[PDB]
Design a protein around this nucleic acid. Structure first.
Ligand SMILES: *C(=O)[C@H](CCSC)NC=O
Ligand SMILES: [Mg+2]
Ligand SMILES: [Mg+2]
Ligand SMILES: [Mg+2]
Ligand SMILES: [Mg+2]
Ligand SMILES: [Mg+2]
Ligand SMILES: [Mg+2]
Ligand SMILES: [Mg+2]
Ligand SMILES: [Mg+2]
Ligand SMILES: [Mg+2]
Ligand SMILES: [Mg+2]
Ligand SMILES: [Mg+2]
Ligand SMILES: [Mg+2]
Ligand SMILES: [Mg+2]
Ligand SMILES: [Mg+2]
Ligand SMILES: [Mg+2]
Ligand SMILES: [Mg+2]
Ligand SMILES: [Mg+2]
Ligand SMILES: [Mg+2]
Ligand SMILES: [Mg+2]
Ligand SMILES: [Mg+2]
Ligand SMILES: [Mg+2]
Ligand SMILES: [Mg+2]
Ligand SMILES: [Mg+2]
Ligand SMILES: [Mg+2]
Ligand SMILES: [Mg+2]
Ligand SMILES: [Mg+2]
Ligand SMILES: [Mg+2]
Ligand SMILES: [Mg+2]
Ligand SMILES: [Mg+2]
Ligand SMILES: [Mg+2]
Ligand SMILES: [Mg+2]
Ligand SMILES: [Mg+2]
Ligand SMILES: [Mg+2]
Ligand SMILES: [Mg+2]
Ligand SMILES: [Mg+2]
Ligand SMILES: [Mg+2]
Ligand SMILES: [Mg+2]
Ligand SMILES: [Mg+2]
Ligand SMILES: [Mg+2]
Ligand SMILES: [Mg+2]
Ligand SMILES: [Mg+2]
Ligand SMILES: [Mg+2]
Ligand SMILES: [Mg+2]
Ligand SMILES: [Mg+2]
Ligand SMILES: [Mg+2]
Ligand SMILES: [Mg+2]
Ligand SMILES: [Mg+2]
Ligand SMILES: [Mg+2]
Ligand SMILES: [Mg+2]
Ligand SMILES: [Mg+2]
Ligand SMILES: [Mg+2]
Ligand SMILES: [Mg+2]
Ligand SMILES: [Mg+2]
Ligand SMILES: [Mg+2]
Ligand SMILES: [Mg+2]
Ligand SMILES: [Mg+2]
Ligand SMILES: [Mg+2]
Ligand SMILES: [Mg+2]
Ligand SMILES: [Mg+2]
Ligand SMILES: [Mg+2]
Ligand SMILES: [Mg+2]
Ligand SMILES: [Mg+2]
Ligand SMILES: [Mg+2]
Ligand SMILES: [Mg+2]
Ligand SMILES: [Mg+2]
Ligand SMILES: [Mg+2]
Ligand SMILES: [Mg+2]
Ligand SMILES: [Mg+2]
Ligand SMILES: [Mg+2]
Ligand SMILES: [Mg+2]
Ligand SMILES: [Mg+2]
Ligand SMILES: [Mg+2]
Ligand SMILES: [Mg+2]
Ligand SMILES: [Mg+2]
Ligand SMILES: [Mg+2]
Ligand SMILES: [Mg+2]
Ligand SMILES: [Zn+2]
Lengths: 48, 62, 96, 77
RNA sequence: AAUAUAUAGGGUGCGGGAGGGAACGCGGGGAAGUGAAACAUCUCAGUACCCGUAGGAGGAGAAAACAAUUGUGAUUCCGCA
RNA sequence: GCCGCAGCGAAAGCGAGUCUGAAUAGGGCGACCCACACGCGCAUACGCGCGUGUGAAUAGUGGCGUGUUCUGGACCCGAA
RNA sequence: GGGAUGAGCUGUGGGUAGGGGUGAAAGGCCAAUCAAACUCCGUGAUAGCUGGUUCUCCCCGAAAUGCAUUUAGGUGCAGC
RNA sequence: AUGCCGUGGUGUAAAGCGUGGCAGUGAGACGGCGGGGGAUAAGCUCCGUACGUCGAAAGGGAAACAGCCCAGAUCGCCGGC
RNA sequence: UACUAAAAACACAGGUCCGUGCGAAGUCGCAAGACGAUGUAUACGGACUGACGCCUGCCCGGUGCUGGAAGGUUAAGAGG
RNA sequence: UUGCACUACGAGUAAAGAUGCUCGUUACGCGCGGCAGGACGAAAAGACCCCGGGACCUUCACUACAACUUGGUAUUGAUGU
RNA sequence: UCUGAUCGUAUUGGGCAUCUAACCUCGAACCCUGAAUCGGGUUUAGGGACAGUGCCUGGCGGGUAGUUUAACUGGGGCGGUUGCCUCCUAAAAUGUAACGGAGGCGCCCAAAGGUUCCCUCAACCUGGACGGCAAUCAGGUGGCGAGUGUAAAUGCACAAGGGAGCUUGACUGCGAGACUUACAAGUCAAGCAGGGACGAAAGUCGGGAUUAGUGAUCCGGCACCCCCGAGUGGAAGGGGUG
């Protein structure tokens, strides 16, 4: 019910981050601004 | 005959230029989600074998 | 260690591999060309062996530790970057 | 025999308490009072910490005192 | 011979084999106790034992060889690596 | 042939440095003599930088002896 | 004391061999030994277990606690 | 109250610390004091104590009496306290 | 039960069930071969009750045994 | 069988049941026939109990193998439908 | 020429039936054979591409074989327990045992995180339509008796408790110096740089008031980096980072 999701970038698609969400409270994939070390700046991040 | 070296401990320890015996650090292979980045950075790199272990570790490399 | 997981199984393996094709070079500094050859001249790979500065039948490589004041014309494999400077700063040369 | 091991368990002692006392020269970063909560409060040149650890920010001598009821840990620089 | 071509089998005369030996050799069969602080993979160990079969020794051997851009040029054995 | 002669790094590789890193940021590992004269930016006298020494103390490796350890039955005796 | 014309007792000769024989069944018997015989070899089997370990003097001198353990009468590391 | 950490004086040879060689030990016992278990029973059991002794400590005293009190045997003496 | 147990234990004639159509089934053997048997279902082997008299009730869910093959799952080989 | 030997008893004390220690009490030295209370008498490195190892036995504990058995393929062919 | 049906020639595969020549017979006769219930050969009578065996493959398999079957324990068995977190025992630092006395944990939260600004509660007293001991309202008294996602302790009213706007630092590259410690581990960390969030600024932010919500190594899986690439160029595989 609390799986480990991974957060890939939206420009270079590198899987930079891993965290946990709830699956019944959040059926759709998270979107967060996080730092991308390849791009050198904050990009968007969805799940996979 | 001839003294065989321990094949396991020679894949885990090595020597520097002066004679210190370095090693890596545990707890950094899996189950890395709940470990914050202040912990996975403390376990990064190499450290010196402690002063109490360095007799048995030397005798397994020789 | 009495039963527990010992020091050579608690700890992870050292990372990486060992290169099968690594070519090692034997080391002479340019601060040893000064002390062994103060009159200068030709410094061959065979001349460094007989003076005891380097081993037999191996590839030499001149590095740049120390001062150089003599005027030497040294032939070697793979000169360093900072050793072509100190050799030509006295009037010599460096050929492969 | 009545198996009255209904309660036979404990945690590990956490080594809390005051670690550098008064009039004692410290370095930058030395942990002064490790504790649960703010039994002691940060004063001058003392930061709190993530689990209320009360380290040091500047070398000097440690002195304790009172600041409106809440007792403080300070460092004379 | 049955059965015809013929063979199986029989008669006669020449040569040879069998068995033994302390170790060594080559081909084949092949444990366990033990070690793993238990044990099954693995070890012990292709060891003990066993079978075939030699020779004064045997086996191997005259490149479907290595090597890596120059090269070495049958095999066996010892020292290194 | 072995050991000493340069190290760092997973390795390519570079080398009194080197790996990590965007970093002329910081750390890890490794090198690196002020007890004195002099010149010099110049420190109150005291020292960073840099030349000649006053001529700083380095150093390994092969035998033999001894203590311990390793592979073997391994200090000796003893099963079912 | 039980059988004593019977599923009787007995002589001589022969057969069955070790995870096998034989058993009107007790794990009985198989050369004074049997819940897997004897002899030789692997073999100087292994034993965290018990026992033993030989001349002298001089100086210093403990521990029986902590941590972990298929660990609790063993052992590693720390303390001394 | 004690104990504990820091610092400034003073005192004390065989104290402390770093790094190597070689260990043994990891079954403790009783006594004083503070406690848990037990019936505030045990020569009972489990902990604390810069507490002691035995273990590894002879000599004197407690009739005898590892653990209590006094005292620490280098050797000699038909000397004193 | 040779060597502490002779019994109520084992055997037994009698009973039932299951196996076997004949170099049988079962057993000793890697095989050939043998016993079974110079026997042929009124015989032979396996299991359990144990002269004789009166009798032997109910349960096919569980695990076996025998027979069946509708559908489910399932190896190598073919296929590529 | 046996460490010794000019080997009493009571009430004690001690590894908690003393010929050997303490305080007492009793006993002339040595033999021969008897008795069996103690010498924790003699014999068997406790068979019970626990700890470590071993054996053999069981089963719907684990992993294997003999035997029995399935299908493919070789031995393995021809003509029909 | 394509979807679909049908027909024809050739090739090959599966069933069923027949055939004989491989193979099979402890059916018979004859011969080696003088003496033969063995054996082989010839002929005949039946079976027949089945059976048997070889290689591959699934099933069943105490019939047999090698071994495991935990420790703690006021003797063993039976019962109970084993790791992490909080209290007391615990003798006013730290630490401290027993099958001593009490309880919790193997999570939950996309806001219950970051920041900025504002607020003060429970209980009680008086008044009030349905309305009651206690819903909502108004006023007094009230300094913490309420509250904190979750156990207890230490905290917290200056709020870490109640409310709202914007957000993603629930970051990447690191880290002087310390706590704890046999070792392996565990804990805290000012500050520097990149790139951000809130705020007028100062500044605070590397998850949550704090301490549990976990698992060494080995062997594998995926994404990325393009480091080695067994003659060379690739590839296979290995390596690093997450
Ligand atoms: C139990 O007492 C007994 C032992 C023999 S007498 C000490 N067990 C079996 O015989
Ligand atoms: Mg939501
Ligand atoms: Mg990894
Ligand atoms: Mg991480
Ligand atoms: Mg374990
Ligand atoms: Mg606690
Ligand atoms: Mg936190
Ligand atoms: Mg011969
Ligand atoms: Mg074995
Ligand atoms: Mg074995
Ligand atoms: Mg073993
Ligand atoms: Mg052993
Ligand atoms: Mg020859
Ligand atoms: Mg290296
Ligand atoms: Mg550096
Ligand atoms: Mg010698
Ligand atoms: Mg009579
Ligand atoms: Mg009579
Ligand atoms: Mg009679
Ligand atoms: Mg019996
Ligand atoms: Mg006998
Ligand atoms: Mg046996
Ligand atoms: Mg052997
Ligand atoms: Mg032995
Ligand atoms: Mg002394
Ligand atoms: Mg030790
Ligand atoms: Mg112990
Ligand atoms: Mg102990
Ligand atoms: Mg004790
Ligand atoms: Mg006691
Ligand atoms: Mg005491
Ligand atoms: Mg007391
Ligand atoms: Mg006791
Ligand atoms: Mg003493
Ligand atoms: Mg002792
Ligand atoms: Mg004494
Ligand atoms: Mg005395
Ligand atoms: Mg006396
Ligand atoms: Mg006097
Ligand atoms: Mg008898
Ligand atoms: Mg009798
Ligand atoms: Mg019958
Ligand atoms: Mg048969
Ligand atoms: Mg019948
Ligand atoms: Mg039956
Ligand atoms: Mg009966
Ligand atoms: Mg049925
Ligand atoms: Mg007398
Ligand atoms: Mg007496
Ligand atoms: Mg007496
Ligand atoms: Mg006497
Ligand atoms: Mg007499
Ligand atoms: Mg008598
Ligand atoms: Mg008696
Ligand atoms: Mg006796
Ligand atoms: Mg005994
Ligand atoms: Mg069965
Ligand atoms: Mg078949
Ligand atoms: Mg077949
Ligand atoms: Mg078995
Ligand atoms: Mg036990
Ligand atoms: Mg008990
Ligand atoms: Mg305390
Ligand atoms: Mg205290
Ligand atoms: Mg519980
Ligand atoms: Mg908010
Ligand atoms: Mg709040
Ligand atoms: Mg996270
Ligand atoms: Mg650090
Ligand atoms: Mg910034
Ligand atoms: Mg702004
Ligand atoms: Mg910060
Ligand atoms: Mg929490
Ligand atoms: Mg492993
Ligand atoms: Mg290639
Ligand atoms: Mg790849
Ligand atoms: Mg990194
Ligand atoms: Zn990106």
């Amino acid at each position: 019910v609390r799986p480990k999701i991974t957060l890939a970038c939206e420009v270079c698609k590198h899987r930079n981050y891993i965290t946990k969400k709830n699956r019944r409270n959040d059926p759709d994939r998270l979107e967060l601004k996080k730092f991308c070390p390849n791009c050198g700046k904050h990009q968007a991040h969805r799940e996979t | 005959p001839k003294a065989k070296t321990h094949s396991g401990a020679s894949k885990r320890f090595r020597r520097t230029g002066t004679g210190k015996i370095v090693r890596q650090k545990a707890n950094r292979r899996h189950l890395l989600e709940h470990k914050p980045s202040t912990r996975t950075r403390r376990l990064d790199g190499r450290t010196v074998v402690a002063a109490n272990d360095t007799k048995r570790v030397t005798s397994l490399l020789n | 260690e009495g039963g527990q997981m010992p020091i050579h199984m608690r700890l992870p393996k050292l990372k990486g591999f060992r290169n099968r094709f690594r070519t090692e070079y034997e080391i002479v500094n340019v601060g040893d060309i000064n002390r062994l050859f103060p009159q200068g001249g030709a410094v061959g790979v065979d001349d460094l062996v007989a003076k005891g500065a380097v081993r037999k039948n191996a590839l030499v490589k001149v590095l740049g530790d120390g001062k150089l004041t003599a005027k030497v014309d040294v032939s070697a494999h793979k000169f360093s970057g900072s050793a072509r400077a100190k050799i030509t700063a006295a009037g010599g040369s460096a050929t492969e | 025999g009545a198996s009255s091991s209904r309660n036979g368990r404990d945690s590990a002692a956490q080594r809390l308490g005051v670690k550098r006392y008064g009039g004692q020269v410290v370095k930058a970063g030395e942990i002064l009072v490790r504790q649960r909560g703010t039994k002691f409060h940060p004063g001058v040149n003392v930061g709190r910490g993530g689990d209320d650890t009360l380290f040091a920010k500047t070398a000097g001598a440690v002195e304790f005192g009172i600041k409106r009821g809440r007792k403080t840990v300070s460092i004379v620089g």
